[PDB]
Design a protein around this ligand. Structure first.
Ligand SMILES: *C/C=C1/C(=C/C2=NC(=C\c3[nH]c(/C=C4/NC(=O)C(C=C)=C4C)c(C)c3CCC(=O)O)/C(CCC(=O)O)=C2C)NC(=O)[C@H]1C
Length: 489
């Protein structure tokens, strides 16, 4: 077995058989009686000799320490400043997973509260995320701090950045979903924090990698777990020697990551990591609440806007004329780059929309698939091949029925997503490569993403769809109310 670009999507990164060099690791049985595995550097760090496997935990660590560890017993217990029998001092991380006890040893001020105080008053998602990269960079001292937000398809967008002036910007850039494989996302979801202390360091083998019964050691919750050589190469091509990531959990899902990159080796001590993880939890909670508030404000605004229109309709004899005069104002309901009105087989457009002569084909399509419901796509050329030609202007379409009887619609459009990019990076910046080649570089990642979203628009969110359904009911309703008046006209 060797990992490469053909099979890295399935790399079993939870069982790498190695740890990072800034600590050592002992695996014991579920009762913590016997040593089953140990990293090769345990002898050096703990002051021991030969094969530790088979020796008892007490033999290896001391009765005192084993007692304290048992008492501490999948969320790892953090025990700063513990001592082994001979007086060597360690920050110890202890957990049980799959009924194996894993003990991690690192040879070894109100920070979290003060950091959290500086974000608690953020009053929008942007205000929260902008200040956080700045704050985390200043407090933790990394050369770059980013926040990635995952799109619905899994792609990452770099939504905030604080960096050393001489580093290139990645702000507004996207990376393909495949840049972080599924197993990596599963581990990000399980552990608040992920540390890479030295990307160019030499990893330390776990002894044995595979036990007598054929089982590998599952290091899913071990902070010393080594990382993929694919990512190692990616980091090295970027000039990045160390990282720490904080998982952003919103509504029980992985919303994104706060990622700290350092151009030289770096690892935070256990007490600072505890503070950073606590910060991450509060950041996640506050973000969750701010997203929810923004959604509420958006729905509230839309209802008020629909009421304003209904108020006008109550003083107009001719609803169709009112719609022809007003339809552009519905662009305020749902973010869009254009909007149009298809009523009585005539088209009226505003903003970025398909060309006038393309509309009858589009309207026939909408009438065939709507079935009196909101219908939406962010890949219009997949439904109408001829739409490819105008994808630069209108690649996404959301259609709202506005009559219970006639095939009349209000149509919202969005441009293909590359047209709305706001990328702060340097197009002249290039990257060196290793054996796997230029795939493992930001430049190439971004190019792959751009190619993957050709002819597609930003997807219509659940909130967009909810507003559209409310608008359908309002407009179908008022059309029915005016139907005798319009029959007369
Ligand atoms: C086929 C597998 C691939 C792969 C695997 C891994 N990626 C991991 C982390 C990771 N990779 C990236 C990708 C980036 N794309 C960019 O464009 C960019 C910067 C502009 C970056 C940094 C990211 C964002 C991350 C998240 C951590 C970080 O940002 O430093 C990963 C886990 C590493 C670990 O064990 O902690 C695996 C495994 N990466 C690939 O690119 C493909 C080929």
């Amino acid at each position: 077995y060797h990992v490469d670009l053909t099979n890295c999507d399935r790399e079993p990164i939870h069982i790498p058989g190695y740890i990072q060099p800034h600590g050592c690791l002992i695996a014991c049985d579920n009762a913590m009686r016997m040593v089953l595995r140990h990293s090769e550097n345990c002898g050096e760090l703990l002051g021991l000799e030969g094969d530790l496997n088979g020796r008892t935990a007490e033999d290896v660590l001391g009765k005192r320490l084993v007692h304290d560890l048992r008492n501490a017993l999948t969320r790892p217990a953090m025990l700063p400043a513990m001592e082994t029998s001979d007086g060597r001092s360690f920050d110890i991380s202890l957990h049980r997973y799959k009924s194996t006890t894993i003990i991690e040893f690192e040879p070894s001020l109100g920070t979290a509260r003060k950091m959290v105080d500086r974000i608690r008053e953020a009053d929008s998602v942007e205000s929260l995320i902008s200040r956080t990269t700045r704050l985390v960079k200043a407090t933790l001292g990394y050369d770059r701090v980013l926040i990635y937000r995952f799109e619905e398809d899994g792609a990452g967008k770099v939504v905030s950045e604080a960096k050393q002036p001489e580093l290139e910007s990645f702000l507004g850039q996207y990376f393909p979903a495949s840049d972080i494989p599924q197993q990596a996302r599963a581990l990000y979801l399980k552990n608040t924090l992920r540390i890479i202390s030295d990307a160019s360091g030499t990893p330390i083998p776990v002894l044995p990698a595979v036990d007598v019964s054929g089982e590998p050691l599952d290091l899913s919750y071990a902070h010393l777990r080594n990382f993929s050589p694919i990512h190692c190469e990616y980091l090295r091509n970027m000039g990045v020697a160390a990282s720490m990531s904080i998982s952003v959990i919103v509504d029980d899902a992985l919303w994104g990551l706060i990622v700290c990159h350092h151009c030289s080796p770096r690892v935070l001590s256990m007490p600072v990591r505890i503070a950073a993880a606590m910060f991450g939890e509060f950041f996640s909670m506050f973000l969750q609440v701010l997203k929810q508030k923004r959604r509420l404000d958006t729905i509230n605004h839309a209802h008020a806007a629909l009421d304003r229109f209904l108020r006008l309709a109550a003083h107009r004899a001719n609803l169709e004329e009112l719609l022809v005069d007003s339809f552009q104002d519905f662009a305020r309901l749902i973010p869009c780059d254009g909007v149009g009105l298809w009523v009585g087989n005539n088209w009226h457009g505003h903003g970025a929309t398909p060309p006038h002569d393309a509309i009858p084909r589009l309207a026939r399509f909408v009438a065939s698939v709507s079935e009196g419901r909101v219908w939406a796509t962010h890949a219009l050329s997949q439904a109408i091949p001829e739409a490819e030609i105008y994808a630069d202007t209108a690649a996404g379409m959301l259609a709202i029925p506005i009559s219970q009887v006639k095939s009349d619609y209000l149509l919202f459009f969005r441009k293909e997503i590359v047209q709305n990019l706001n990328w702060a990076g340097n197009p002249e910046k290039s990257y060196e490569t290793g054996p796997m080649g230029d795939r493992l570089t930001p430049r190439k990642s971004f190019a792959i993403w751009k190619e993957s979203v050709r002819l597609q628009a930003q997807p219509w969110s659940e909130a967009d769809r909810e507003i559209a359904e409310t608008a359908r009911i309002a407009l179908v309703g008022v059309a029915f109310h005016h139907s005798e008046l319009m029959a007369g006209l």
